[PDB]
């Protein structure tokens, strides 16, 4: 389907997941942004979710099927490749130490991970022409932020499988003949 | 169960472990603190315990069970995931060579590890909805320290397993019909 | 077949693939350039494709056949080696956020890869005296660009197999004789 | 036993081994020094031996034993663990090149290692509640002293196994009853 | 058979190979030099080939033979070891983009490698008391060059097997005596 | 114990090997020198041999045998350990391009290696209470010398096995008695 359609669908799904998480855990507000912005921009203080695409795998020999155009007397050769892409998803949130109600960035990451692994969401995204494999690890990494202090940047990887289509032209034959020799 | 409840329970358990270890080995005093403080802080010159969260393991396919709400004619889908989290426990203590009564930081770390591996503590913590696996190594590391005096920072990691719950909605059907052809 | 002819054939094939991709996805314009420019150059602000040559495997023991020159009474020894050359192909394209029609550099790389894996292109290139093996991965890498805005540099590896020929001289014999001893 | 008793003992047998080695090879004098001083130090220009604790291995599931206190009607739960507590031994000596009688630092390290591997020393140590495993390697490393006079620093690792004890309380029951239904 | 004659024979063979390659591919001129310049030198701006020895493998237990000197009543013990040595062959050539006739440094490296693998070359070499094993890889590497212009430095490894001889003396016996007891 | 004597014997053997090599290959003159000099010293221009001791391996459980002292009524417990020592041998020689008679540093290293692997030298060394195992590699490395004049530093490893002894005291018993019960 190529990137743009997949990215748009993933953004919509992430927005829905973040809305569900906000109702579930009661954190103030959220944003969904892509990690590598093509223009000089600044981070947002709101609880944020990030995504990025990193490497790709073709997964299998290409499959070709032939469709015939009668008017022009040509075969249209369609080749389909079943591709797998891995997306990195990470979140960010700063912990105010004098608020009695506590929600962690790891909690947001875990909830977003669990939402995408549910069977209902898989059933819903099936009609969006892609499925999701299993997620096996979520890690907490600590850095020193920009205001100094300390902060966590949890992250995990997701795999999305879909189909890629290309179109080409080929000649067609309409009769056969031979010779027999003894 | 997520993080806040888990962290609070672990803090209470660590406080109890130090309460025991103080009569066990005759410390001056103790404190339990978390690593990665969100605010700038200074360390304390007393026997101290530090803990931190490293990563998570989903450990198995999600399990879904269905509960029916009769009034609104809806199924509420409950999905449970059995997660494993690794916490890194470390201690700090400075050795005064003049005192004749000697207690080591590695000694405190060993006692804390032994406390969590006892059968009685596991039986008591079972009602707190998580359990502990085995601990396989404790390591001593030496650093220069701010006062240019060599010091030890023993550490080990611990694993606790629990359940995470998410909640969603789904439609319900109340009748069936079909057609038979031959 | 040595490197230069292979490079020319690869260049014309890449130009054809780029024309097909432009008709497929509506690029502004394209360009095919080699990476390691001998003379100093400055790169172009267009959707471009890059290729480079790296590694070389001989793949098998050499095979020799003999052709006889009657006039000079000499054997001409021809030795053929079936070579496997690896090419790395990468692309560049800067995403402009405000335009609604979106095409990514990874899309260009994916289409170029898919073109070279099609069966019709293999049939066309066979009469050009080389064939292509399977491609197994594509990777996205993010760098900082000469402007201080982020960018992506997708890449993948391609394998091309062909034959190499060398000619040498050797003496010839025209009669035999022996002695029998008992 | 915890660190203090073990370290004091190891010091005592280290002094005994050094005395035996001095009678064996006619050293000037010797010292036994730990390789982590909490206070600033300066090291000594003498044939010295160094030791330090590296890490720990719990080595097996804990074993619990129950001892009953009749007066208070309580069980005292004793838990025993059997650890390994690897140590690192290293020596230092400067080789004066114009003395006929020659002894190397590697000689000191080898003799100290051989002393601890003898069966008589093992039998004597056994009454001190720990035992020694096998030693597999000794290595020479070249320093540069203090911007002069290249020097050698031999080292090797040693393992001493023992038991660790912890005590806890638990309730006790004195009678049983039941109900039979069919 | 030690290094000096090895290098002499190798440079003669490389000169012959380059004379053949010049006819085959029409270089302007060539030159063979070593990468072990004992004196400061400055390289040449001509198609150049380089060689150097990396290491050595003994390849087998030594084989001893005994030859008797009657006049001096001594055995001369000859020991032979079948040595394998590794040489690195690499080439340099700068690409002028304006010339229409194109030849690559990779082409020169490939031709030189192919020349040494031919049957006729091995037959010629055999009477020079060494042989060549199989070559398995050639790699292109790009560097900045002293004119700030990219260029390639292809290289590959070759293996040469030969024999080494040393001679020593040993006593000789000429009679035997015995005693029989029961 | 038993190291300085080993170095003295090894130095004598190396001097003999260099005498043989000088007669065999016509060196100007030679020197045998140990690395890691305990005093600030300078390298010599003459063809030189450098040796060093790297590490030791105990190779087997210790073996104890008992010798009885009748006068003092004590057992003298002798423990023997059969260790292996790894020595690194390297040579240095600067090539003069204008002299027609050529000898390489690798030739010196190879001749020294071959001398120690001969059966005659092993038989002669057997009376000196140690033996040599097999040598499996010799490598060339390039230094930079005096800011230019690249140079080679060939090296290889040798293994020497021997026995080392320790002596200790133990009590003795002279009679036995028992009790039989039923």
């Amino acid at each position: 389907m190529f990137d743009g359609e997949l990215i748009a669908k993933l953004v919509v799904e992430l927005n829905a997941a973040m809305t569900s998480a906000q109702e579930a855990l009661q954190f103030p507000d959220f944003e969904v942004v892509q990690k590598a912005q093509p223009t000089q921009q600044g981070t947002s203080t709101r609880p944020t979710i990030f995504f990025q695409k990193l490497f790709d795998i073709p997964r299998g020999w290409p499959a070709t099927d032939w469709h015939l155009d009668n008017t022009a007397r040509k075969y249209v050769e369609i080749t389909r490749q079943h591709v797998e892409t891995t997306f990195q998803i990470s979140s960010l949130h700063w912990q105010n130490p004098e608020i009695t109600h506590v929600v962690t960035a790891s909690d947001i990451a875990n909830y977003v991970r669990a939402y995408f692994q549910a069977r209902s969401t898989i059933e819903r995204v099936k009609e969006l022409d892609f499925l999701i494999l299993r997620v096996s690890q979520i890690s907490n990494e600590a850095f020193e932020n920009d205001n100094h202090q300390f902060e966590f940047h949890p992250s995990f990887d997701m795999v999305v499988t879909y189909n890629q289509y290309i179109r080409l032209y080929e000649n067609a034959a309409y009769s056969a003949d031979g010779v027999l020799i003894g």
Side-chain angles (χ1 to χ4, degrees), chain A:
Chain A
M1 294 182 286
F2 294 131
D3 289 30
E5 182 179 1
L6 192 53
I7 299 298
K9 294 179 180 178
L10 212 66
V11 162
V12 165
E13 288 327 291
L14 285 172
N15 274 292
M18 268 297 176
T19 293
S20 161
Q22 192 182 20
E23 270 66 63
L25 303 187
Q26 296 153 250
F27 57 85
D29 276 322
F30 59 91
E31 290 208 10
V32 182
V33 295
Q34 192 158 5
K35 211 161 199 62
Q37 305 274 332
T39 307
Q40 171 182 0
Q41 305 258 356
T43 315
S44 64
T45 61
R46 311 171 137 79
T48 313
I49 193 66
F50 296 89
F51 69 92
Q52 200 196 324
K53 184 212 301 213
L54 61 84
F55 77 79
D56 181 307
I57 296 169
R59 193 50 82 230
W61 283 35
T64 65
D65 53 328
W66 276 273
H67 166 259
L68 162 73
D69 186 74
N70 263 317
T71 62
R73 310 187 79 79
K74 313 288 296 320
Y75 280 161
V76 189
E77 157 179 0
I78 297 97
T79 303
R80 177 192 53 96
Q81 178 77 62
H82 180 80
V83 177
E84 301 185 5
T85 64
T86 62
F87 285 73
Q88 184 145 42
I89 296 169
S90 66
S91 82
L92 214 50
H93 196 207
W94 182 71
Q95 307 292 355
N96 193 225
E98 71 275 50
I99 298 299
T100 181
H101 153 90
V102 288
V103 61
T104 312
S106 69
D107 293 358
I108 310 190
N110 282 2
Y111 196 99
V112 177
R113 190 259 316 151
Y115 183 85
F116 269 116
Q117 299 297 285
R119 270 147 182 132
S120 68
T121 66
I122 291 169
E123 287 218 28
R124 180 192 337 134
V125 303
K126 183 202 181 113
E127 57 91 10
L128 295 181
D129 291 331
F130 64 94
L131 264 51
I132 304 166
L133 303 178
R134 188 173 180 270
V135 168
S136 53
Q137 179 152 5
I138 304 152
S139 51
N140 270 44
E141 183 215 349
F143 62 111
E144 209 161 352
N145 208 357
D146 56 7
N147 306 335
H148 287 256
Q149 306 169 347
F150 277 98
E151 185 177 1
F152 288 118
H153 191 52
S155 175
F156 78 90
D157 293 335
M158 181 195 278
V159 186
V160 171
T161 75
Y162 63 110
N163 283 295
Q164 264 175 193
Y165 282 118
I166 191 173
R167 202 157 316 248
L168 278 188
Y169 274 138
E170 181 56 297
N171 287 317
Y174 275 81
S175 84
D177 64 43
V179 294
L180 318 184
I181 317 164

